Swiss-Prot record, chain A:
Shown residues in whole-protein numbering: 1 to 84 of 126
Predominant location category: cytoplasm
Keywords of the record: Acetylation, Cytoplasm, Methylation, mRNA processing, mRNA splicing, Nucleus, Repeat, Ribonucleoprotein, RNA-binding, Spliceosome
Organism in which the protein naturally occurs: Homo sapiens
Note: In the autoimmune disease systemic lupus erythematosus, antinuclear antibodies are developed with Sm specificity.
Family under the similarity heading: Belongs to the snRNP core protein family.
Protein name: Small nuclear ribonucleoprotein Sm D3
Swiss-Prot record, chain B:
Gene name per UniProt: SNRNP40
Protein location: Nucleus
Organism in which the protein naturally occurs: Homo sapiens (Human)
Major subcellular location class: nucleus
PROSITE patterns: WD_REPEATS_1, WD_REPEATS_2, WD_REPEATS_REGION
Gene Ontology MF term list: RNA binding
Key word Cell cycle present: no
Gene3D superfamilies noted in UniProt: YVTN repeat-like/Quinoprotein amine dehydrogenase
Keyword Protein transport: no
Taxonomic classification: Eukaryota, Metazoa, Chordata, Craniata, Vertebrata
Biological role stated in the UniProt entry: Required for pre-mRNA splicing as component of the activated spliceosome. Component of the U5 small nuclear ribonucleoprotein (snRNP) complex and the U4/U6-U5 tri-snRNP complex, building blocks of the spliceosome. As a component of the minor spliceosome, involved in the splicing of U12-type introns in pre-mRNAs.
Keywords assigned: Isopeptide bond, Methylation, mRNA processing, mRNA splicing, Nucleus, Repeat, Spliceosome, Ubl conjugation, WD repeat
GO biological process, one term: mRNA splicing, via spliceosome
Record text on subunit structure and interactions: Component of the pre-catalytic and catalytic spliceosome complexes. Component of the postcatalytic spliceosome P complex. Part of the U5 snRNP complex. Interacts with PRPF8. Component of the U4/U6-U5 tri-snRNP complex composed of the U4, U6 and U5 snRNAs and at least PRPF3, PRPF4, PRPF6, PRPF8, PRPF31, SNRNP200, TXNL4A, WDR57, SNRNP40, DDX23, CD2BP2, PPIH, SNU13, EFTUD2, SART1 and USP39. Component of the minor spliceosome, which splices U12-type introns.
Name assigned to this protein: U5 small nuclear ribonucleoprotein 40 kDa protein
UniProtKB/Swiss-Prot annotation, chain D:
Phylogenetic placement of the source organism: Eukaryota, Metazoa, Chordata, Craniata, Vertebrata
UniProt-reported outcome of changing L57K: Loss of interaction with CLNS1A
Location of this chain's protein in the cell: Cytoplasm, Cytosol; Nucleus
Descriptive protein name: Small nuclear ribonucleoprotein Sm D1
Function: Plays a role in pre-mRNA splicing as a core component of the spliceosomal U1, U2, U4 and U5 small nuclear ribonucleoproteins (snRNPs), the building blocks of the spliceosome. Component of both the pre-catalytic spliceosome B complex and activated spliceosome C complexes. As a component of the minor spliceosome, involved in the splicing of U12-type introns in pre-mRNAs. May act as a charged protein scaffold to promote snRNP assembly or strengthen snRNP-snRNP interactions through non-specific electrostatic contacts with RNA.
Keywords for the protein's UniProt record, in alphabetical order: Cytoplasm, Isopeptide bond, Methylation, mRNA processing, mRNA splicing, Nucleus, Repeat, Ribonucleoprotein, Spliceosome, Ubl conjugation
Source taxon at top rank: Eukaryota
GO biological process: 7-methylguanosine cap hypermethylation; mRNA splicing, via spliceosome; RNA splicing; spliceosomal complex assembly; spliceosomal snRNP assembly; U2-type prespliceosome assembly
Gene name of the record: SNRPD1
UniProtKB/Swiss-Prot annotation, chain G:
Known role: Plays a role in pre-mRNA splicing as core component of precatalytic, catalytic and postcatalytic spliceosomal complexes, both of the predominant U2-type spliceosome and the minor U12-type spliceosome. Functions as a scaffold that mediates the ordered assembly of spliceosomal proteins and snRNAs. Required for the assembly of the U4/U6-U5 tri-snRNP complex, a building block of the spliceosome. Functions as a scaffold that positions spliceosomal U2, U5 and U6 snRNAs at splice sites on pre-mRNA substrates, so that splicing can occur. Interacts with both the 5' and the 3' splice site.
Source superkingdom: Eukaryota
Section of the entire sequence shown: 25 to 217 of 2335
Gene designation per UniProt: PRPF8
Disease affiliated with this protein: Retinitis pigmentosa 13: A retinal dystrophy belonging to the group of pigmentary retinopathies. Retinitis pigmentosa is characterized by retinal pigment deposits visible on fundus examination and primary loss of rod photoreceptor cells followed by secondary loss of cone photoreceptors. Patients typically have night vision blindness and loss of midperipheral visual field. As their condition progresses, they lose their far peripheral visual field and eventually central vision as well.
Taxonomic lineage: Eukaryota, Metazoa, Chordata, Craniata, Vertebrata
Record protein name field: Pre-mRNA-processing-splicing factor 8
Subcellular location(s) per record: Nucleus; Nucleus speckle
RNA sequence: ACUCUGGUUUCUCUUCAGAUCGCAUAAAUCUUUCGCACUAAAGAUUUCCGUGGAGAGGAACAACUCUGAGUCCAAUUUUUUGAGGCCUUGCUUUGGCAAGGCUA
């Protein structure tokens, strides 16, 4: 009644390797440490593909969830209990 | 042979009369019910076992019917009710309780929304959306109705009864549009083709009619008249069915003979023995030329017609 | 220790079957009345 | 609240221009309180593209620029409370 | 809000705010229209199909959902 | 019901903020609100012209903040 | 057809389906106490003798339905033979187990108080009637006699309040749903 | 927040029940064991006292509590906007798309 299913799947994706695209086209693949009700994602050990194609290694990242276009989660969470 | 199953093989297990028999439209299972207050689900092929049983009628089952989906089975009973069942695990998903007398008929809406037009001995022809749990529209016929059916469009109801006339009611006009007159006694059985243009009629004038329920009106809809049939002192609800290719009609008779005519030739193709009582409903398999027949002899006769 | 579990019956009752016969009737009596009645009836059975 | 006027508008064939210029012509089926518009019999022309026939659509309510209602609409009996 | 509970597990096409297409199995949603789509393939224009997996699409960037296919077995 | 963004991991840390219009900034975090506006000590601006511009204590609206990178090890 | 030959046609069909699919064409007595009192007072042998086989059932059903010492009179349903050969106490002595244990614990209290009070307790002589003395007719000297109080323990209205209205009944709350 | 089930009690029948069917406990018979069998144990069967469940049938009064079903949010973080306009190429399906640079 209060919290939705996709934020439960986002909380279920913590510890896993998620790849989050942001509003400025930058793709961040790495270990999602923590995520909140708003989609503020503290992630770590991040491989970053910018818009040009350059890849950087940013070891501790906190993305503001407003700017997140989407996150690609592991398909393990296709069997997560809140997706039933 | 020209089928998959055995020859003339019999179905025993009904404890009293069988008033209605219907084929599942996929053609691998079978439903038969009657005076037992108890629907039996058979297998069409194989050893013809009885794999499931449906209890939940407090009175005899007047009309069994299947939607073209085939998953849910509609059952107009004698008491006051029409039950809606499922066919796989077999529990009554719904009761429909609005008629004040003996419900003689039901019919599935197969194309659009799942509507069950029913008719009963009070005269009310009631339509039943299953999500409403109530009577949508009640067409008040002054006399008893013994057989009701939809058209192909599911936008008209075709009720045959004891008023000597077949009466069609429009679902949007909410009036009787025209009265198919030409019967001399109570009209007991109405069935409509898969292509939906023609409609069969059985009555206690011992004659069978074919009408053409269609918007294109030829101003006298009694195109084909069939003889051979008889209605007796038992005064049952002698039902009807169409072949899925539309080539053969079958009307249940009171002289223990499974009747099958040709639509074009207007002659009795099949006059089959074996039954001992008045034959209430005779049905057609959807895929193969197989005929089941339900009669008062507490038995069913499956059989390869061709 | 010697308890074996009770065995599968068909639930016949003796007094319901007596009540189903024309030879038995139902009433409501004082217990000391049927006490004297059972003592007299057993006395009559043993003397018979 | 004017969105309540739109959820009274069930089964109307309206066009909707979005913020991406895409004009969606179809019979409206459902409205949320956030104008989440669910449509059927959809003829959607995404702009700078040829129009595509699709059987069902569900626009998010934020992304609607405007609606276009037909001539035959009785809004004087629709915007009452 | 049953108008999209009608669409769960249907293979849906989600046109986004940049113009990208998400053809994915519609698993879940919430009040903010954040979608959970599984086995989601991105379609962009020059045509190419880019498999992603389980996409948590934030609702800000969703324009329009539409069904591509019936739910699988 | 606005919960604060979970940033005591990042307090007193050297972070590089990305800001909205392709912009970038560096500095020490000193706190936040539930709206993720960040207060920054030792702020070096670091524009795209390439020359690095120190300010000090600044406040950044949380609307404009794309990402934090903790340059220091948390 | 006509109108009257479509109303009589409906009347003949309503009176056909109303009786053909009628729900009856779908696919015990108590006696007064005196009737058995006169039968055992005034008393085809086969009837009497096929009755008389079940006499230990009568003994067991009588002794198991004994009135507990907080009951003066226990009326029991009795299944008797019409020849008066056997009377069966038909009921089974069902007691709510906390009520039954509480009633017997009150019995323990009151009987200990009475053995403390009655210093020289006079036990019943056994057998209470001698051998060649006929058993008493219930109607002539027991029927109208009032039994001496039973042993129900006095229950004070303050602490025993949810129990005292029904504590010493036969089957205490049997009529209470 | 509007509508349709199902009730409860009692009497009886039928079948299943190795589940403390019994929060209690009998008896008979057979076999075995030792004594030398009420004062003794084991195993098994049976009968009794008398249960639970399901199904069915009657008859008494309750009929919508319950078990279900059908039926107040524009100010950062989502849904009341940073939106719109210019330049080069690859192809133009000469509509324009894709990438980047911009300007606001």
């Amino acid at each position: 009644m209060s919290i939705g299913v996709p934020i439960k799947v986002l909380h279920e994706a913590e510890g896993h390797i998620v790849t989050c695209e942001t509003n400025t086209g930058e793709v961040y693949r790495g270990k999602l440490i923590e995520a909140e009700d708003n989609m503020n994602c503290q992630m770590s050990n991040i491989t970053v593909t910018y818009r040009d194609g350059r890849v950087a290694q940013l070891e501790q990242v906190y993305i503001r969830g407003s700017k997140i276009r989407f996150l690609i989660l592991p398909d393990m969470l296709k069997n997560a209990p809140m997706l039933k | 042979r020209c089928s998959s199953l055995q020859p003339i093989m019999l179905l025993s297990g009904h404890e009293g009369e069988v008033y209605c028999c219907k084929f599942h439209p996929n053609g691998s299972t079978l439903a038969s019910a009657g005076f037992d207050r108890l629907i039996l689900l058979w297998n069409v092929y194989g050893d013809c076992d009885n794999y499931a049983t449906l209890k939940g009628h407090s009175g005899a089952v007047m009309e069994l019917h299947y939607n073209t989906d085939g998953s849910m089975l509609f059952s107009a009973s004698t008491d006051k009710t029409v039950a809606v069942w499922d066919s796989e695990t077999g529990e009554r998903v719904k009761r429909l309780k609005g008629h004040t007398s003996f419900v003689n008929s039901c019919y599935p809406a197969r194309r659009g929304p799942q509507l069950v037009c029913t008719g009963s001995d009070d005269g009310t022809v009631k339509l039943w959306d299953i999500r409403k749990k109530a009577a949508i529209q009640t067409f008040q016929n002054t006399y008893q109705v013994l057989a009701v059916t939809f058209n192909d469009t599911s936008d008209q109801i075709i009720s045959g009864g004891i008023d000597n006339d077949i009466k069609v009611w429009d679902l949007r006009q909410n009036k009787l549009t025209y009265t198919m007159r030409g019967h001399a006694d109570s009209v007991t059985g109405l069935s409509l083709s898969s292509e939906g243009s023609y409609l069969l009629s059985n009555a206690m004038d011992n004659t069978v009619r074919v009408w053409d329920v269609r918007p294109f009106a030829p101003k006298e809809r009694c195109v084909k008249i069939f003889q051979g049939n008889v209605h007796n002192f038992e005064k049952n609800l002698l039902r009807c069915s169409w072949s899925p290719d539309g080539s053969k009609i079958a009307a249940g008779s009171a002289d223990r003979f499974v009747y099958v005519w040709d639509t074009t030739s207007r002659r009795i193709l099949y006059k089959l023995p074996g039954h001992a009582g008045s034959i209430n409903e005779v049905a057609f398999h959807p895929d193969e030329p197989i005929i089941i027949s339900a009669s008062s002899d507490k038995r069913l006769y499956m059989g390869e017609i061709q | 220790l010697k308890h074996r579990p009770p065995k599968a019956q068909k639930k016949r009752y003796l007094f319901r079957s007596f009540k189903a016969t024309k030879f038995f009737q139902s009433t409501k009596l004082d217990w000391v009345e049927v006490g004297l009645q059972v003592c007299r009836q057993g006395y009559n059975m043993l003397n018979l | 609240k004017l969105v309540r006027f739109l959820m009274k508008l069930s089964h109307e064939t309206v066009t909707i221009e979005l913020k991406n210029g895409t004009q969606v012509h179809g019979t409206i089926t459902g409205v949320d309180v956030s104008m989440n518009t669910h449509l059927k019999a959809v003829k959607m022309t995404l702009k700078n593209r040829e129009p595509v026939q699709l059987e069902t659509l569900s626009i998010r309510g934020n992304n609607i620029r405007y609606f276009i209602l037909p001539d035959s609409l009785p809004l004087d009996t629709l915007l009452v409370d | 809000s049953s108008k999209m509970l009608q669409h769960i597990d249907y293979r849906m096409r989600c046109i986004l705010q940049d113009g990208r297409i998400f053809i994915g199995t519609f698993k879940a949603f919430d009040k903010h229209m954040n979608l959970i789509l599984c086995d989601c393939d991105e379609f962009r224009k020059r045509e190419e199909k880019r498999v992603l997996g389980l996409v948590l699409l934030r609702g800000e960037n969703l324009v329009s959902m539409t069904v591509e296919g019936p739910p699988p077995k | 019901k606005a919960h604060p963004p979970e940033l005591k991991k990042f307090m007193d840390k050297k972070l590089s903020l990305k800001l909205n219009g392709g912009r970038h900034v560096q500095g020490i975090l000193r706190g936040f609100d539930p709206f993720m506006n960040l207060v920054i000590d030792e702020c070096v601006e670091m524009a795209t012209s390439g020359q690095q511009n120190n300010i000090g204590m600044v406040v950044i609206r949380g609307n404009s903040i794309i990402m934090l990178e903790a340059l220091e090890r948390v | 057809m006509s109108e009257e030959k479509l109303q009589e046609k409906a009347r003949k069909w309503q009176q056909l389906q109303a009786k053909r699919y009628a729900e009856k064409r779908k696919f015990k007595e108590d006696m007064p106490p005196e009737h058995v009192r006169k039968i055992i007072r005034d008393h085809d042998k086969r009837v009497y003798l096929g009755a008389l086989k079940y006499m230990p059932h009568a003994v067991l059903k009588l002794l198991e339905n004994m009135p507990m010492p907080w009951e003066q009179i226990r009326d029991v349903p009795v299944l008797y033979h019409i020849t008066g050969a056997i009377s069966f106490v038909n009921e089974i002595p069902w007691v709510i187990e906390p009520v039954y244990i509480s009633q017997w614990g009150s019995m323990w209290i009151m009987m200990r108080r009475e053995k403390r009070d009655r210093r020289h307790f006079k036990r019943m002589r056994f057998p209470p009637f001698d051998d060649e003395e006929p058993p008493l007719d219930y109607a002539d000297n027991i029927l109208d006699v009032e039994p001496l109080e039973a042993i129900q323990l006095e229950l004070d209205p303050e602490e025993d309040a949810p129990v005292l209205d029904w504590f010493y009944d036969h089957q205490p709350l049997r009529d209470s749903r």
